[PDB]
Design an enzyme around this catalytic site. Structure first.
Site, mmCIF file in Angstrom:
data_model
loop_
_atom_site.group_PDB
_atom_site.id
_atom_site.type_symbol
_atom_site.label_atom_id
_atom_site.label_comp_id
_atom_site.label_asym_id
_atom_site.label_seq_id
_atom_site.Cartn_x
_atom_site.Cartn_y
_atom_site.Cartn_z
ATOM 1 N N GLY A 26 76.180 4.517 -13.674
ATOM 2 C CA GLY A 26 76.547 5.668 -14.475
ATOM 3 C C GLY A 26 75.415 6.243 -15.307
ATOM 4 N N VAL A 32 67.123 5.673 -12.616
ATOM 5 C CA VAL A 32 67.173 4.700 -11.547
ATOM 6 C C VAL A 32 68.354 5.099 -10.690
ATOM 7 C CG1 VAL A 32 67.421 2.279 -10.937
ATOM 8 C CG2 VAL A 32 66.241 2.933 -13.078
ATOM 9 N N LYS A 47 63.661 3.396 -9.066
ATOM 10 C CA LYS A 47 63.330 3.953 -10.356
ATOM 11 C C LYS A 47 62.334 5.067 -10.102
ATOM 12 C CE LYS A 47 61.430 2.933 -14.897
ATOM 13 N NZ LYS A 47 60.892 1.876 -15.803
ATOM 14 N N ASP A 135 61.542 -8.515 -23.887
ATOM 15 C CA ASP A 135 62.911 -8.040 -24.059
ATOM 16 C C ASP A 135 63.928 -8.897 -23.305
ATOM 17 O OD1 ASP A 135 64.985 -6.456 -24.992
ATOM 18 O OD2 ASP A 135 64.553 -4.753 -23.694
ATOM 19 N N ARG A 139 71.466 -8.236 -20.922
ATOM 20 C CA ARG A 139 71.454 -6.877 -20.387
ATOM 21 C C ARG A 139 70.265 -6.675 -19.428
ATOM 22 N NH1 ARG A 139 70.142 -6.931 -25.778
ATOM 23 N NH2 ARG A 139 67.905 -6.555 -26.149
ATOM 24 N N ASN A 140 69.237 -7.517 -19.547
ATOM 25 C CA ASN A 140 68.068 -7.410 -18.669
ATOM 26 C C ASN A 140 68.054 -8.401 -17.478
ATOM 27 O OD1 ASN A 140 66.363 -5.195 -19.294
ATOM 28 N ND2 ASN A 140 65.777 -6.183 -21.221
ATOM 29 N N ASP A 153 63.536 -6.308 -16.160
ATOM 30 C CA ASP A 153 63.089 -5.626 -17.380
ATOM 31 C C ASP A 153 63.333 -4.143 -17.120
ATOM 32 O OD1 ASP A 153 61.693 -4.184 -19.378
ATOM 33 O OD2 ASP A 153 60.267 -5.808 -19.662
HETATM 34 C C1 LIG Z 1 64.184 0.267 -9.728
HETATM 35 C C2 LIG Z 1 63.496 -0.769 -10.614
HETATM 36 C C3 LIG Z 1 62.163 -0.454 -11.026
HETATM 37 C C4 LIG Z 1 61.435 -1.364 -11.862
HETATM 38 C C5 LIG Z 1 62.029 -2.577 -12.284
HETATM 39 N N1 LIG Z 1 61.241 -3.439 -13.124
HETATM 40 C C6 LIG Z 1 61.485 -4.621 -13.690
HETATM 41 O O1 LIG Z 1 62.628 -5.077 -13.728
HETATM 42 C C7 LIG Z 1 60.381 -5.410 -14.316
HETATM 43 C C8 LIG Z 1 59.157 -4.866 -14.819
HETATM 44 C C9 LIG Z 1 58.183 -5.705 -15.400
HETATM 45 C C10 LIG Z 1 58.395 -7.144 -15.512
HETATM 46 C C11 LIG Z 1 57.242 -7.955 -16.180
HETATM 47 N N2 LIG Z 1 56.405 -7.309 -17.229
HETATM 48 C C12 LIG Z 1 55.192 -8.047 -17.631
HETATM 49 C C13 LIG Z 1 55.258 -8.110 -19.161
HETATM 50 C C14 LIG Z 1 56.044 -6.810 -19.463
HETATM 51 N N3 LIG Z 1 56.512 -6.615 -20.907
HETATM 52 C C15 LIG Z 1 57.485 -5.464 -20.978
HETATM 53 C C16 LIG Z 1 55.450 -6.473 -21.925
HETATM 54 C C17 LIG Z 1 57.162 -6.977 -18.465
HETATM 55 C C18 LIG Z 1 59.661 -7.716 -14.995
HETATM 56 C C19 LIG Z 1 60.056 -9.236 -15.039
HETATM 57 F F1 LIG Z 1 61.280 -9.481 -14.470
HETATM 58 F F2 LIG Z 1 59.111 -9.999 -14.433
HETATM 59 F F3 LIG Z 1 60.178 -9.633 -16.336
HETATM 60 C C20 LIG Z 1 60.597 -6.822 -14.418
HETATM 61 C C21 LIG Z 1 63.381 -2.887 -11.862
HETATM 62 C C22 LIG Z 1 64.085 -1.989 -11.042
HETATM 63 N N4 LIG Z 1 65.387 -2.334 -10.672
HETATM 64 C C23 LIG Z 1 66.575 -2.007 -11.313
HETATM 65 N N5 LIG Z 1 66.545 -1.279 -12.421
HETATM 66 C C24 LIG Z 1 67.735 -0.966 -13.038
HETATM 67 C C25 LIG Z 1 68.983 -1.392 -12.508
HETATM 68 C C26 LIG Z 1 68.912 -2.194 -11.263
HETATM 69 C C27 LIG Z 1 70.049 -2.682 -10.608
HETATM 70 C C28 LIG Z 1 69.964 -3.468 -9.354
HETATM 71 N N6 LIG Z 1 71.051 -3.955 -8.698
HETATM 72 C C29 LIG Z 1 72.255 -3.703 -9.230
HETATM 73 N N7 LIG Z 1 72.501 -3.011 -10.357
HETATM 74 C C30 LIG Z 1 71.444 -2.509 -11.034
HETATM 75 N N8 LIG Z 1 67.673 -2.455 -10.724
#
Ligand SMILES: Cc1ccc(NC(=O)c2ccc(CN3CC[C@H](N(C)C)C3)c(C(F)(F)F)c2)cc1Nc1nccc(-c2cncnc2)n1
Length: 270
Positions: A26, A32, A47, A135, A139-140, A153
């Site tokens: 939603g 995304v 995304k 974070d 929720r993450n 994240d």
């Molecule tokens: C599309 C997409 C693009 C980028 C990411 N990035 C990370 O999760 C993502 C980005 C960066 C990091 C790591 N960095 C390094 C340090 C940095 N911090 C902030 C300083 C974080 C991570 C990790 F998991 F490793 F923590 C994940 C994830 C998605 N996937 C996504 N997004 C929203 C909802 C859904 C979804 C999927 N299926 C069903 N319903 C919902 N999927």
């Protein structure tokens, strides 16, 4: 991309190979969308997008991490706009809502322990790679089939979070040193994991219920800590309290946290 090209990046993919659909959840996750990787009839999350800088930085980070419990990067479209970042799609969405809406007879105590164990494994890996999450919260996290949980994240602070240190931080998941000196480290992730354990143990209740954000810090400084949730095993709560040690150096490392969970889970699950 040309394997011989000087600019070859195995992660770049054909935008045309993706069939973008409706926004995910939603629109709770921001820009995304649900998508289908044509060549495989696979549902994926895409995304899209001068946060182009921050965006690429995220893409670059995701190419450096791989673990069974970390959202899996599948590919990117950062050749030209619109920029894309594709990951796998997790069937049952974010862990927070999952905990609140689940069949508690199915998601029993052994499963809660299983989820904690998977999350600590993901964090142990990030710890090893010297990455800082910043974070960590329910929720993450994502939930798949067979109670598979992966840490993600979603950059939610711009989509719980309140104005602070210029940015927006989830005060109730933030370590003291992070609230006071903006000092973020894997130890502040360890503090956030403890809060996450509390979220799991309560099937997704909000932390420090009823307590206004403005009083949290002072309370923490005076040694106040959330109480053991009803039905939460003593060993787990003991872990929560250790993650919430006022001095980061006194908090356990994720390797140690994972170790402790493995032990417990196998003991209950057998
Ligand atoms: C599309 C997409 C693009 C980028 C990411 N990035 C990370 O999760 C993502 C980005 C960066 C990091 C790591 N960095 C390094 C340090 C940095 N911090 C902030 C300083 C974080 C991570 C990790 F998991 F490793 F923590 C994940 C994830 C998605 N996937 C996504 N997004 C929203 C909802 C859904 C979804 C999927 N299926 C069903 N319903 C919902 N999927």
């Amino acid at each position: 991309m040309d394997p011989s090209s000087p600019n070859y990046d195995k992660w770049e993919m054909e935008r045309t190979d993706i069939t973008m659909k409706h926004k995910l959840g939603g629109g709770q996750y921001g820009e995304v969308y649900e998508g289908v990787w044509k060549k495989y009839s696979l549902t994926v999350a895409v995304k899209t997008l001068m946060e182009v800088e921050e965006f690429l930085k995220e893409a670059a980070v995701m190419k450096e991490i791989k673990h069974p419990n970390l959202v899996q990067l599948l590919g990117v479209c950062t050749r030209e706009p619109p920029f894309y970042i594709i990951t796998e799609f997790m069937t049952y969405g974010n862990l927070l809502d999952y905990l609140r809406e689940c069949n508690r007879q199915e998601v029993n105590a052994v499963v809660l322990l299983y989820m904690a164990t998977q999350i600590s494994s993901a964090m142990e890996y990030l710890e090893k790679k010297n990455f800082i999450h910043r974070d960590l919260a329910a929720r993450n996290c994502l939930v798949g089939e067979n109670h598979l949980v992966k840490v993600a994240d979603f950059g939610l602070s711009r989509l719980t979070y309140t104005a602070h240190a210029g940015a927006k931080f989830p005060i109730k998941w933030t370590a003291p040193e992070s609230l006071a000196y903006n000092k973020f480290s894997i130890k502040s992730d360890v503090w956030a994991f403890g809060v996450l354990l509390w979220e799991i143990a309560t099937y997704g209740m909000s932390p420090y219920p009823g307590i206004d954000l403005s009083q949290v810090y002072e309370l923490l400084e005076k040694d106040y800590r959330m109480e053991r949730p009803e039905g939460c095993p003593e060993k787990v709560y003991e872990l929560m309290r250790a993650c919430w040690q006022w001095n980061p150096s006194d908090r356990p490392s994720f390797a140690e946290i994972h170790q402790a969970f493995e032990t417990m889970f196998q003991e209950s699950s057998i």
